[PDB]
Structure formats: structure tokens, C-alpha cells
Amino acid sequence: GTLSIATTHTQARYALPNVISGFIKQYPDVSLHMHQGTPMQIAEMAADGTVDFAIATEALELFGDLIMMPCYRWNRCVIVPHGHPLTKLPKLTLEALAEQPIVTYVFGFTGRSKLDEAFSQRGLVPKVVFTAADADVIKTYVRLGLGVGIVAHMAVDPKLDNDLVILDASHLFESSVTKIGFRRGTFLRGFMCDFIEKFAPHLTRELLAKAVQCHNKAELDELFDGIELPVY
Amino acid sequence: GTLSIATTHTQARYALPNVISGFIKQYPDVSLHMHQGTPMQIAEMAADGTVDFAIATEALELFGDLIMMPCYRWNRCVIVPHGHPLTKLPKLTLEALAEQPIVTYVFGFTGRSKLDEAFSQRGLVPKVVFTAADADVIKTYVRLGLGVGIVAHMAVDPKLDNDLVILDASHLFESSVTKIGFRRGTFLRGFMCDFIEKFAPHLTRELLAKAVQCHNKAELDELFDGIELPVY
Which of B134, B160, B175 is the last residue of a domain? Predict the structure, then answer.
């Protein structure tokens, strides 16, 4: 058969490679197709049946035709070059961060709204000098010295990114949730359910068989609010 | 003053970092702002004056309000893991590529149309299993074993990307040209011209002072056809 996934840079690059490896090893003869686009593009491709699944933090919520299901919870990091002034602070504050030029996601990408919320509630105006679409660009301009990076935690690793200093910022921002969606009325074949469960182990077949019944977002929220999510 | 640039992953990540570093050191008190988006959005941000300059291979040609200028010429390479069968070929052919799974850019991004043209001219249908928006994703799924990558030559580095084999494909595809555009009627301040000239040394102030006069694409083409571009 065929498995078709539309997703974003964040997931394609940091969340999916090991599950895609595993899927391909387990299902050598399923025709895999993947596509990367903006959250609106990929969400609408899943919503109208162009592909099986959309995976992203953003836009999925806006399409009522989607059975959307939470996969994991995450929060942000601040990344700066070695010896940068923010590395000298005992603890990071929103006020210290707001005094720096910021390199972070464009509006509407990868939980950016939570950052704006945190700044506005304290009456702070971030000086955002680079609005980027992905964390690879963010990291190259942090490296060259353009300013302070604010990225999703799964986009940075203390060993892989040793040339940068990672400061945890999850106490300054509300966390975000990465979700998976498929069009309501889709028949979930076995290998599809195994992919979903590889990506999000709590989405067992027992739970899937309840999720396909949810007629609208209220019923999904009733099904999932009780459930604990992995944190990355 | 302020210098404001909207560009793509390709340029932000492979063509601009050294010129942006140089610009920052030369003009510490110019307020630099950058934005990364799809070629259509960044082209229209330049056209309506939201930013000074757009830099990309695609879409700029569609905005008549833009003074568009060629910056450099480039072509594609094929990237595969070590020991992949295509490395055994003396020289790469389109037929050898067409029997492989391909990982490359989505339609309308980064010269993909030249790939589509080359294949269709031979009655070959590429099996594109991953349509990606950027070369960072492309390279991770080539590394993961998903198939053969086709990327802009500047998206891969023989030293940095030591784990991949780069095979020249420039005899199989027509070359692409990266352009810079700004809205007609923009006043080019000194630091703007110094930025442009760092990005494209043939665009000297003499040449800029002729380009601002070109009322349309025909006059631009008459001005620029004579000039040779650096190749990356």
C-alpha cells in the first residue's frame, strides 16, 4: 500500500527520522511519500485527502475536517554563542531576553504565538531582527553573531550543538503541543496505525478506535484532556 | 539607517552568511532586519516596499515593479550515501536517475522546474518520494537511506558533508540564476549598494545607476545579457 505524510521542517528534521527508519524497516513494501510545506499547506492537504497525515504544532487546529490528535508536548530554548552575555546570568528572565536582538520563528510557525504572549503580558517588546522559517537558518545566524536564538527544544541538542550554549527557557513560555491529523472518514490501515503508534506511543489502536468517532473538536478534547503526553 | 532583506532557505543558509557578517562589521549602526519565506511572499514584500531587497532564484521575474538583477549562476548535484550504485557510474545519466527514488525540492522552489524540464524532454518520469522545501531536510533523508538527493550545488560542501557523495549533474540540467530585486523608485543608499556589491561584485554603482533607469524587463535584459556571472 501507500503511506503519505505532509509535515514541517521541525518534525521532518528532528522528530521523524528514527520513526521513518523504523517504519521503512518494518514495511519495506509500503510506498512511502513525504512532503514538506507550511503548516497551512500540509494541514489542508491532509484535510482534503491529498495525503494521509499532517504532523505539526500549528494550523492543524483550524481544519474541522481533521481528526487531530496530540503527539507530544515541548517548550523552548534560548541559544547563544559561547561567552554571550546571557550565558553569564545565574538565571534567564524575560527582561534580560527582551534587551537582546532576537532570531526566532516567523509569525504562525512553531509556537511563535507563545513567545509573543509571554512578552506582551509583561509589557515587553522583543527586538526581532530575523524572522526565520526553520531552526537551521536560526542557528546559522545565531552562530555568526546576529543575536539571540529562540527555538523549540527538539531543534537543539547539547552534544550535537556544542558550538552553541543552550539555556532552558521553558519557565518563561507556555508549552506547545505537536499534533497529527487525518481526514475524518479515513480508513486506518494496519501500517498507518503502526506509524502513528511509533510516532506517539499513547495513540494505541484502542484509542484510535475512539478517536475516529469524534464528530468535532469538542469530542476530541473530551477524549484526550485526561491523557498525559511525552515531553521533548 | 535600515537594511531589510527577505530571502529563502537557500540564500539565507548558503549564500548570505559571509556577506552579512562582512556587512555587520562594516556598518555596525545600520539596523539590519531579515526575513525568510517562500519565494512568492518575499518577492511581493520587495515589490510593495515592505523590505528593501528580495533574493531568490524563483518568483522575482513575476513582479514588474521590481528592478531585478542577476547575482550568480548555479546548477544541481546528486548526493547519495557512500557505496550507492550511482557512484559506480563513470558519468551520470538522466535514465540512471529516473530509476531511483528521488528526494528534491517541491514544485516552484530552487530550480525544480529545470529538473522537470530535463526529465520530460527525455520522456522520463522521476519517482520523487520526498518533495522538500529545503536542502537540510533533503540531506537528512538522503543520509537516512530514503533515496537520491538532487540539490543546488551550494547546498552541499565536500568538507562539511563528508558523509555524502556528490556527483556532478550539471551536464543534465540547464543552469539557474539567483536574483536580487528591489522596488522601482527605491533610493539606493550607500550601505545598500555596498551590500549588493558584496553579494554580487559585478553590480557596481555604475551598473546600479544604469539598472534603476530600466522601466521594464526588456530594458533590464538589454542591460544584463552581456555580463558573465560567477558560478557556484
Answer: B175
Domain final residue pick, A175, A191, A212: A175
Say whether both A161 and A96 belong to one domain.
yes
Instruction: Take residue B108 and report the three cell numbers written for it.
Output: 516552484
- Pair B193, B157 in one domain: no
State the total domains in chain A.
2
Between CA B215 and CA A12 the distance in angstroms is 43
Contact A146 B32 (CB under 8 A): yes
Task: Give the single-character DSSP code of B228.
Answer: -
Q: Do A36 and B136 touch (CB under 8 A)?
A: no
Three-state secondary structure along A188-215?
Answer: CCHHHHHHHHHHCCCCCHHHHHHHCCCC
Q: Nearest Cβ partner of B20 from A13, A38, A144? A: A144
Q: At B54, which helix (H) or strand (E)? A: strand B53-56
- Give the sheet arrangement for strand B31-36, strand by strand: A164-168, A76-81, A148-152, A101-105, A127-132, B31-36, B2-7, B53-56, B176-183, B66-74
Q: How far A139 CA sits from the closest chain B CA (Å)?
A: 10
Can you give the residue range of the structural domain that contains B62? 1-74+176-232
